[model samples]
Target: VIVSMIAALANNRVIGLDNKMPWHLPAELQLFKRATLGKPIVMGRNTFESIGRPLPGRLNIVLSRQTDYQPEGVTVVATLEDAVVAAGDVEELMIIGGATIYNQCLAAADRLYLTHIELTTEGDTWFPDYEQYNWQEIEHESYAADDKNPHNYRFSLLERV
Candidate 1:
């Protein structure tokens, strides 16, 4: 199975603050939904909690160390390796993360779909640093901020080198 990662981050790579995203970009969200609609999404338990419910149209796989952890409409695995295996024979699986999960899967990800928000803000959670990985940008598109969107952002598709 192919493993990839999806995330929206600010200029400083901040993904969330207080368990919530600091920016609001409907266009980015739509892009995310379209890209991940039918794939299995692997995430950490905290990421799942922030989402509050199972995302429809995808297999929700959550990684946690708790052997007794169980949530309705989701598969709970004990490790990132197990989560990947739980995805079965799918051609691709998306890792939608909290910081810890991202770090754990960075070495295994073959591709990255990132929404790079153009501003910075105070945040507690961050995406893994990109300096250590060799990535080739395959596609990129920038969008201007509109009434419904709070900031300018760029959607980029990067493949591992």
Candidate 2:
């Protein structure tokens, strides 16, 4: 099965602040949904909490250190290994994040789907440095800043070397 990490990050690599996204980009969100809609989405417990609800139309597998962390409409696991097993023969699994999940999954991820936003915003959480991982950019598309999006962004698809 293919393991892919999907995220939107600023040029400075800030992903979130106080468990919330620092920016709002509906177009970027649409792209995120498109990429992960058919795949089982694996995320850490924090990611799940920040989102506040289960994402519909796909499997929601959450990693939680808490053994009793059961929630309605989602599968809670102890590790990414358990997340993989819960996925059960799917063609691809999309790893969504809350910093630590991305850090842990990078070594095993087959590809990355990154929305590189133009602005350097403030945040405590960050995306791990994937550049040094030797990924080769396979495709990319840049979007100009609009009234709606507020910032220029580039959606890039990269594969592991």
Candidate 3:
């Protein structure tokens, strides 16, 4: 099975601030929903907490060092190794993150789906810097937010070289 990281980031690679989303972009969330509609999503403990609970439709696999942490519908693993093991034979598993998880999955990811938003903001959480791994752009779609949300963003699918 292929492993990858899927994220929505501002132009400056700002994905979060103090462990939360810095921008309110439903489109970005929709983009993620559309892509991982029926796929499995893997995340770290912090990322899982940030999201509150398991997302419906897709299976949520969280990496946590704590043995006591439990969420009703989500699977919690002790490490990324356990996460991979839990993935089984699925064609692909996506790591939807907080920075720490991204750092752990960097070498294992076979592709990346990045929603590159067009604005910059102050942030603490960041996507991994994959200067060493090759990236090939596969698709790009730009979006202008509606009245409900205000943001300029582009969704990109890239294959690792």
Candidate 4:
């Protein structure tokens, strides 16, 4: 089984605020769409609620404690292991996250797809520590936000060591 983390963060390690994304960068959203296409994305309940729907052409798995809760085009799993099992026969599984979900998936993930923003912003949520895993840089590219976006950001790919 292979697990991976995907997030866009500020230099201060801010990923989200008040259960929502703090910035609106079209490029980053496109980055997300491209990175997770045709893959199963596992996320927490709050993160699941933020998107409000399953992204097209991908399998959406929501981690939830409520036994009765389920959504259309989504699989609600009570534990992370169940989510992993639910995504059988895949080469990789992408962990699209809220903070708690990231925490749970960190040790299990094999790679990270990071869209790192250049600026810092105040955020209530934070990413997990990187020191836990040995990381090897895989890919990095920078993009400047234009008239329709927030700030410039970098796309990073990190593979586990």
Predicted model with the maximum lDDT: 2
Q: Write the per-residue lDDT of candidate 4 for residues 38-83, one digit (tens) a residue.
A: 9999999899988889889998999999999998889999998899
Q: Least accurate stretch of 10 residues (summed lDDT) in model 1?
A: 19-28
Query: Which one is best on TM-score?
Result: 2
Q: For residues 9-105, what per-residue lDDT tens digits would candidate 3 score against the true structure?
A: 7866778998789989876788888888788899988898899888999989998878998888999999887888887778988888878888888
- Candidate 4 minimal-lDDT segment of 10 residues: 127-136
Looking at model 3, the pairs that clash are: none
The per-candidate count of clashes, in order, stands at 0, 0, 0, 1
Over all chains combined, what TM-score does candidate 3 have?
0.94
- Ranking by lDDT, best first? 2, 1, 4, 3
RMSD, every candidate, angstroms: 0.9, 0.8, 1.2, 1.1
Ranking 1 against 4 by TM-score, winner: 1
Q: Choose 2 or 4, whichever is better by TM-score.
A: 2
TM-score of each: 0.97, 0.97, 0.94, 0.95
Residue-wise lDDT of candidate 1 within 1-161, one digit each (tens)?
88899999997899999888887887888999999999999999999999899999999999889899888999999977788799999999999998998898888889999998999799999999965989999999999999899799999999999
Cα distance off (Å), candidate 2, residue 16: 0.4
